[PDB]
Structure formats: structure tokens, C-alpha cells
Design a binder for these strands. Structure first.
Ligand SMILES: [Mg+2]
Lengths: 175, 50, 191, 56, 139, 195
RNA sequence: AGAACUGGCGCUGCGGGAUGAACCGAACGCCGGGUUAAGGCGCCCGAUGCCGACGCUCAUCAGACCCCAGAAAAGGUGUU
RNA sequence: CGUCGCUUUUUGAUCCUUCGAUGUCGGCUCUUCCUAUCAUUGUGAAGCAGAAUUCGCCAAGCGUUGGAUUGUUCACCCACU
């Protein structure tokens, strides 16, 4: 996967083809975070083939739909579970974020595993994601915004260079 | 001699730590050499008494 | 982490009145006046409250090694309250074997002229940072006293004597010779 | 759930060049009528043709 | 020094972006560089705007933390922001900057002729003060 | 005609990149007061990489070879030189519309000077990181005109604080002169279309 | 040094990799308009002069893009 | 006992350039460069009392000779420093 732009959650269910040995296979469900519905039904077969004896030639997906959030306008706390590969070994890792939506917190994770651990988007697996509440958070970068009557200014503001005249007689005050 | 003044001058001259790598003269409760030449190492030994 | 702000406050007694030009801190007290400029340190200084005169230094956002620098502001500020109301006094004694260390003062406290340091013919004229002055002590042997308002001008000048009386080419585990500081106190006491 | 019929036609274009090409994977492009870069062809979807498109 | 903070209720302007020139009210901050805002009476609904896109003013609003759309709307108009915004010297600067921007070719002729007329009258009455200044300092 | 760029508070290569594009395009550019140019990174680091430049010297005679200039007008000039195609005649002329000075000369102490917000230190550095002045990395390496330049600048800046004395003397006057009367008819149409 | 399979170079220009036998794109009659590939867009030097997004990093030897043109074990209360 | 490296002043290994020719050892003369520092400057550590040594650090600025045997490079000895 490349994990391009903002990601997008998918509910991908699927079953393996009916054999003479097992009519009606149990048809498992997954929760795929992917850029579009072609990579999502590809990564469905990456994880299902790790757990069951299913593979895309002996299976079919029966539904791949975008599941989106039930409260886009509510500030939530997302603690997620990772299984990235490093240069020496591989590691399990709990890692909190904070976003309006479910699918944008896992976008913020790939941007952050690549930043802090150089972990590319293929060598990283998402175990599970849920909204957690306050007093169950561990990370103080997330915890410090749990503040009724939170306030801070914006010191040393800088933006809009060369869009203004590139040569002026006016030193730009940074507030 | 002046044994109180003996211990006062020994505060600046003997009661210190010596690094085995950067050979510094640090302070008697160091854990690290402060010099970048040894990469702030953590193998120290006290200054050798008379 | 880039934390939301930290702040220390400085309780200021009434006999000292602090004004600020910005990140400059002007400290006026009984025994003079002294100032510092903190225009390199990227913080705001707000002196709040009538009748009580609290000084709150707070740094918004900031990284962890710029969280370590808000405490350094308030510690230099307290040493300006202390130095302008009580002064600083570093008492240094002369530790010597067989050769006595002769010490005089040439010019008004601003020059200390050390000679006979371990039998040497070469004099050691140590000039001091302006604002401090010397005194040969009384009722104690071989002692020198340094008094002034700024702790960085007392203590750096105290280090110029202790560095000048340095034994070369010899063992410094024996040959304990020099004029080392003995005490870190104030000029006026018990306040 | 209703899963539909997986499709019977496909459109294949060629996005790579002529030079530096293995001998099995240029025979099939010769059989798909994909000789130049950026040539297209409709392909009947069959098990024999799905395994031709996986070679290439 | 730092006279205006972000805060729940702080009415911010929006400089650039797809909601440029309209006001918002900061409802909730999410993390460090984005904030959930809405304008209930100024046609920019509830969404996350970054802080470098917004533009803090001197107006606060008193409503509970992360309320609904209605209680921001009641607080927007019990304070009467949109009347109080347009009667400030910075809403007049942003209005005048787009009056000059739509000044047509005939109107720019009239702005010319009625400018060199008053620049004469100000240069006459500032030179009739230069003569009056030396006559004061002649004694 | 000519843009006049006051060089202080600017960075070395961010300013030199904009000048070396404005001067291939046919403009005349005068960079003034190059003593005050900043350069990012602490002073000892920028002074090392100029001393490493000094040992670059052709062995058989140093008289032919790399010419290590020492005034900051020529340090900045050689930075612009390395961003221009100076071995072609389209680039020979490009170096010749650049008159970079040191201090501020008598043609240029009475022109309005522009700055470049794309190369200012305040805009472009993060403030917890250190910088070097080009004035004292020139002085530490062989330049002998720092004190005679600072003497002439504080005599230059003193002749302008009396110019700015009497410039805002007129601005106080013509603001009280516009207080008076009867120009309201002309302010009807200018306030209507951005006073 | 010697084999296997495939491609290429030799016989082959062109765009890129600053430089180049073989790398990466793409193969070539003579031209106009359009659009891309690989690679790029501070200035040499065409194009980010976007009010680009999130983080990491300070080097008194910083880092900087396949082949590829320089490094290891070991260590750091340096910071994440 | 291990084990990871660097260097190209050793010797190999290889056979790319040169067979219509690149004059092949050593010394003498002479200039420059490197640092992995013998000495001289400033230093830290000793099982540094002093004297003398020893081990590290910034550092190539400035020096590093006179001879006997030998074609010698290398060696080895006398003497000065
Ligand atoms: Mg390939």
C-alpha cells in the first residue's frame, strides 16, 4: 500500500467458495483503512490469508463498502494498536491520537510512524482502533488538551511569502 | 598543614572523578563525561588517592 | 512534546522595586541597582499585582530544552533581588605549605597583587570585574573577601584569583597551594 | 448480501515500452494486439485470458 | 504581550482558504494546529480549521465547551457580533480595500479630479502655516 | 530603474538567489549595507568554512588562483557570482548590473531602500537557532575596515534622525492642516472609494 | 576466473542519472500543435513565486535520491 | 580466548592501460604535502614526593644531524643532540 492522501475506512466481508466438504463457509468481516476500494479488497486478502486458509483464488468478497463515522463534528480520542516492522525486528506499539473522525486518526498514524520511526506504509499493520474517553488516556500530548477553559496565544506568526510583493520597504511584524 | 585547609584544597584537587576515555576531571558525583570527544561515556573512575 | 505553558513566579519584597523594559529586568534596591537583558531567550515577563509585586515568567508552547530555560530566568532574577538587598560575599582563604602567600591590594579593591606564591619571583596582578572590591580580613589568617551586587561579577572575579594561583608541572594531589573560596554568603545577614 | 457477476469484458492498455522485454511476456502482448505503448484492446474475460493478463 | 488568546468562544476572522473573509467562532481545539469552529450567522458551518488560516479578533463569546449549533447561534446574536463587527476600524479597512478593487475606469477619473483639487487646498493651508511659523519665531 | 536593497537582517544565500534571478532578467540591483547580513548556523561554524575556503590555493603559485576576498561586499558578490552563468557573456553582463556596496554610500543614503521578506532572518529562521553576522566573520578573517565603517554609519544614521525629525514635523503640520474646513466635498468621493 | 536463464552493449542516437558503453525511461524518415515517461521544479537551469499537510533533526566532520563512487562492531542522563 | 575495522609506506593476487618504446636500482641536489607527534608550545592522567619517565588531548608551526663498513634500500656501530 502507499497510503496516499487521507485514508478511508472500509467494511470488507467475504467467504471462500462452497466446496463439497463445507457448504456455507462462515464469511468473516474486517475493517480496512485504505485509499480506495481496490486497495481495500486487496488488503482484505493480505490479513485473511494470515489467519485462515483463505486466498483470493479460492475466495470471494461479498461486500466492500465505505463505513464512515457517526459523529464527524465531535472531538474524539483514538488509541490504536500497531505491528510495524523495523530494520532489526518487529514491534507491538500502542499509540494515541486525537481527531474529529476515525479514518483521519489512522492517516495521522502513517504520517507519524514514517516521521518518528521511518516506517513505510507497507511494513505497518493496524490491529484495532477505537474511540477512548478521557481518564483512560496514557499519552500526555493527547492528555494536555483535556482542559476545560483551555487557552493559548499564537506567538511568532509567519506566512504568505512572495505572494505579497517580493520587494517591499516594510519589515513584516510577527505580532 | 592546617587540616581544615587541607580538606578545603582537596575539594578542588582530589575529590573528583576521572574518565577512562576522555581523561577529564569532572566532579565527584558524575555519571558521564561532558566532552563530545568520547560521546559522553559512562565508564568513570575516581581520582587516584595518594 | 511541545507542551502547553509552564511558569514560575517570583515573590518580591517591598524594599526592592522591579521594572521591566521588555525582556530587560531593572532591579532597584537599597544597596544600588543592577539590570540584565534576556532578549535571547524567547519568553514573556509580566509583573502582576499591586501591593505584592509578583513576577510571573511564562513560556508558551516551547520544546523540552526550552522548558528548561524558564526556571533559569527566575533563578537569575532572585539573585538580583538578593544581590541588591543583601549583597554577595565570597570569603577565600590562602592554603599553603612552607612558602607563605603574600597578598596586597594595589588600587581601591580593583587590583589584587599576589606574590611569593610557592617561592616564585613573578608577581600576579589580577584585575577585577567592575562592581566588586576586596578586603583583607580581620580576626582570621590569610583570608581575602570579595563584595558586590552581581553574583556573576563576584564569582567570576573570585575565579580569577583561584585560576591565577595554579601550580604547574607538579603533582596537584600534594602541593595544595592557592587561594580557594571557603564560603558563599552575603554582606548583610539574617534577613 | 448480493454479490454481482464478475465482469465479462475488460479493457487493457499497454503502459510499458518495447525494449528490454522477456520472450514470454512479448508473445502475449503480440496476442493481445498490444504492440505499441498506449494501445488498447477489449478482452473477453475467461480463465484462459485471466491467466494471460497475469503473465503481463 | 499576548492580549488575545484562542479560547472557547474567541471570534476569529478567516484570512485565506475556501471560507476566506468570513468570521468564525472557536468552539474546540483538537490538537496543536487545528481547531473546530463554526459561524452560525455567517454561513461557515462546523468544521476543523487550522490556526494559521484563521485570524484572532477581540471578540469573545460565552457558551459552554463544544456545544451544539444552536447555543453558538444564540451566543452569536445575544452579543450581536455582526453589527459590532462591521462598526470596527478593521472591518472598514477590509471593506474599503474592495471598494478600490472595484473602482471602474469612469470612477477612477472622478477619484483623480477630486484629489488634485484637495491636494491644492491642503498644500495651500500647510504653506500658510510655514509663513506663520517664522513670524512666530521672528520675535 | 534600479532597486536598492538594504542588506542587513537578510540571509546570505536566500538574498543572493533572488538577486541572481532579478539580474539575469535585465534589472539593476544595488545591495547596500552588506555588513549586517546574517548567515544561519553559529559563528564558529561559519568561520570554519571560510577558513577551509582559504586553504584552497593552487600549489605552484597562489598569485594565479582562487582570489579570496575579505570585505563583505565582495563575499556577497562572490555568492551571487556562483549563482550566475559568469563564463558566458549573458552572465558577464549579469554581474555588471549588480553594484553591491558596504556601508551606505552618498548616492544611496538618501534613496528609499527596500527589503526582501523572502530572505529575512526573522521570517526564515526558527528563533531558537543561532546565526552569524557577516560583519565579524569578515573581521575575524583579514578585513581591516570594520571600525572605520561603524564610525561612518553612526555619523550617517545621525544625519537621518534629523531628517526624520523634520519629516514628521511636516506630517504633524499637514494633519492639523487637513483638520480645517471645506474639503469635505472632495472627501465625499474619496471615502466612498477608499480614502 | 568459470558456468545457467533473460535482456542489453558491441551495431544505438534520444530524455534522465552533474560526468559516463552496459543504469532508468524510451528506440530514431523531415516538421507543426498537444500530452506524457524516467527525473525534477531556491539560483546556475525549463518548471512550487503552492499563504502545501504531519512530524523528526543542530553536527567545533551536519545531511542530501537505484546502479554509485566511502564505513563497522561498541557506546551516549543528546533529543523523539 | 575472542571479535569489528581502517590504511595502501609491505608482499601478493589479478591482467585493465602501454610492445610503430612512458629510459628500469641506489645516492646526490631540491621543493612541497600528509599525520598514525620523536622533539618544541598549551594541556589532562599515573602505581606523578622532587628529578626522570609513562599514557592520552588541541597541534604538522618549526626542527629531525656528523661519520665507519656496504652498490645498497634496509641494516649495524661510533659520536653529537
Ligand atoms: Mg526494470
Amino acid at each position: 500500500m502507499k497510503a496516499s492522501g487521507t485514508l478511508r475506512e472500509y467494511k470488507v466481508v467475504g467467504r471462500c467458495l462452497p466446496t463439497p466438504k463445507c457448504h456455507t463457509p462462515p464469511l468473516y468481516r474486517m475493517r480496512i483503512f485504505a485509499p480506495n476500494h481496490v486497495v481495500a479488497k486487496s488488503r482484505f486478502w493480505y490479513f485473511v490469508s494470515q489467519l485462515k486458509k483463505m486466498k483470493k483464488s479460492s475466495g470471494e468478497i461479498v461486500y466492500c463498502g465505505q463505513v464512515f463515522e457517526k459523529s464527524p463534528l465531535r472531538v474524539k480520542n483514538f488509541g490504536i494498536w500497531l505491528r510495524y516492522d523495523s530494520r532489526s525486528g518487529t514491534h507491538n506499539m500502542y499509540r494515541e491520537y486525537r481527531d474529529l473522525t476515525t479514518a483521519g486518526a489512522v492517516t495521522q498514524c502513517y504520517r507519524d510512524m514514517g516521521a518518528r520511526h521511518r516506517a513505510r506504509a507497507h511494513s505497518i499493520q493496524i490491529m484495532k482502533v477505537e474511540e477512548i474517553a478521557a481518564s483512560k488516556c496514557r499519552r500526555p500530548a493527547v492528555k494536555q488538551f483535556h482542559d476545560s477553559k483551555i487557552k493559548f496565544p499564537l506567538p511568532h506568526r509567519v506566512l504568505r511569502r512572495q505572494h505579497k510583493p517580493r520587494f517591499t520597504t516594510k519589515r513584516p511584524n510577527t505580532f | 598543614i592546617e587540616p581544615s585547609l587541607r580538606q578545603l584544597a582537596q575539594k578542588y584537587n582530589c575529590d573528583k572523578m576521572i574518565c577512562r576515555k576522555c581523561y577529564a576531571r569532572l566532579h565527584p558525583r558524575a555519571v558521564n563525561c561532558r566532552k563530545k570527544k568520547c560521546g559522553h561515556t559512562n565508564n568513570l573512575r575516581p581520582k587516584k588517592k595518594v | 512534546m511541545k507542551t502547553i505553558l509552564s511558569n514560575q513566579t517570583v515573590d518580591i519584597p517591598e524594599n526592592v522595586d522591579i521594572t521591566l523594559k521588555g525582556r530587560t529586568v531593572i532591579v532597584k534596591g537599597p544597596r544600588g541597582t543592577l539590570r540584565r537583558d534576556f532578549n535571547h531567550i524567547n519568553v514573556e515577563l509580566s509583573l502582576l499585582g499591586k501591593k505584592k509585586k509578583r513576577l510571573r515568567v511564562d513560556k508558551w508552547w516551547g520544546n523540552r530544552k526550552e522548558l528548561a530555560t524558564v526556571r533559569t530566568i527566575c533563578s537569575h532574577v532572585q539573585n538580583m533581588i538578593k544581590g541588591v538587598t543583601l549583597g554577595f560575599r565570597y570569603k577565600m582563604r590562602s592554603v599553603y605549605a612552607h612558602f607563605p602567600i603574600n597578598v596586597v591590594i594595589q588600587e581601591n579593591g580593583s587590583l589584587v597583587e599576589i606574590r611569593n606564591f610557592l617561592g616564585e619571583k613573578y608577581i600576579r596582578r589580577v584585575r577585577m570585574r567592575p562592581g566588586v572590591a576586596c578586603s583583607v580580613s580581620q580576626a582570621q589568617k590569610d583570608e581575602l573577601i570579595l563584595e558586590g551586587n552581581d553574583i556573576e561579577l563576584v564569582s567570576n572575579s573570585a575565579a580569577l584569583i583561584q585560576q591565577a594561583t595554579t601550580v604547574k608541572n607538579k603533582d596537584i594531589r600534594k602541593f595544595l597551594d592557592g587561594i580557594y573560596v571557603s564560603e558563599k554568603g552575603t554582606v548583610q545577614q539574617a534577613d | 448480501f448480493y454479490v454481482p457477476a464478475e465482469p465479462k469484458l475488460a479493457f487493457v492498455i499497454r503502459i510499458r515500452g518495447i525494449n528490454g522485454v522477456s520472450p514470454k511476456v512479448r508473445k502475449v502482448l503480440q496476442l493481445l494486439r498490444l504492440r505499441q505503448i498506449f494501445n488498447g484492446t477489449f478482452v473477453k474475460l475467461n480463465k484462459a485470458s485471466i491467466n494471460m493478463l497475469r503473465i503481463v | 504581550v499576548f492580549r488575545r488568546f484562542v479560547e472557547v468562544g474567541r471570534v476569529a476572522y478567516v484570512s485565506f482558504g475556501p471560507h476566506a473573509g468570513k468570521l468564525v467562532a472557536i468552539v474546540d481545539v483538537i490538537d496543536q494546529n487545528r481547531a473546530l469552529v463554526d459561524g452560525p450567522c455567517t454561513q461557515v458551518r462546523r468544521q476543523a480549521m487550522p490556526f494559521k488560516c484563521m485570524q484572532l479578533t477581540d471578540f469573545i463569546l460565552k457558551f459552554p465547551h463544544s456545544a451544539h449549533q444552536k447555543y453558538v447561534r444564540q451566543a452569536w446574536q445575544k452579543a450581536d457580533i455582526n453589527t459590532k463587527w462591521a462598526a470596527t476600524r478593521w472591518a472598514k479597512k477590509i471593506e474599503a480595500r474592495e471598494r478600490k478593487a472595484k473602482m471602474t475606469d469612469f470612477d477612477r477619473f472622478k477619484v483623480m479630479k477630486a484629489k488634485k483639487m484637495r491636494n491644492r487646498i491642503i498644500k495651500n493651508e500647510v504653506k500658510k502655516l510655514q509663513k506663520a511659523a517664522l513670524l512666530k519665531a521672528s520675535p | 530603474q534600479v532597486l536598492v536593497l538594504d542588506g542587513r537582517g537578510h540571509l546570505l544565500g536566500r538574498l543572493a538567489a533572488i538577486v541572481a534571478k532579478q539580474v539575469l532578467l535585465g534589472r539593476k540591483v544595488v545591495v547596500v549595507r552588506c555588513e549586517g547580513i546574517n548567515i544561519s548556523g553559529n559563528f564558529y561554524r561559519n568561520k570554519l568554512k571560510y577558513l577551509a575556503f582559504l586553504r584552497k590555493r593552487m600549489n605552484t603559485n597562489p598569485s594565479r588562483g582562487p582570489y579570496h576576498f575579505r570585505a563583505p561586499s565582495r563575499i556577497f558578490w562572490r555568492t551571487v557570482r556562483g549563482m550566475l552563468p559568469h563564463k558566458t557573456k549573458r552572465g558577464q553582463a549579469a554581474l555588471d548590473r549588480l553594484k553591491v556596496f558596504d556601508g551606505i554610500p552618498p548616492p544611496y543614503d538618501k534613496k528609499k531602500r527596500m527589503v526582501v521578506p523572502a530572505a529575512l532572518k526573522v521570517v526564515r529562521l526558527k528563533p531558537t537557532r543561532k546565526f552569524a553576522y557577516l560583519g565579524r566573520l569578515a573581521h575575524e578573517v583579514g578585513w581591516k575596515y570594520q571600525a572605520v565603517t561603524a564610525t561612518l554609519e553612526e555619523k550617517r544614521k545621525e544625519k537621518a534622525k534629523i531628517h526624520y525629525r523634520k519629516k514628521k514635523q511636516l506630517m504633524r503640520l499637514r494633519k492639523q492642516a487637513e483638520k480645517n474646513v471645506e474639503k469635505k466635498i472632495d472627501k465625499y468621493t474619496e471615502v466612498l472609494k477608499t480614502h
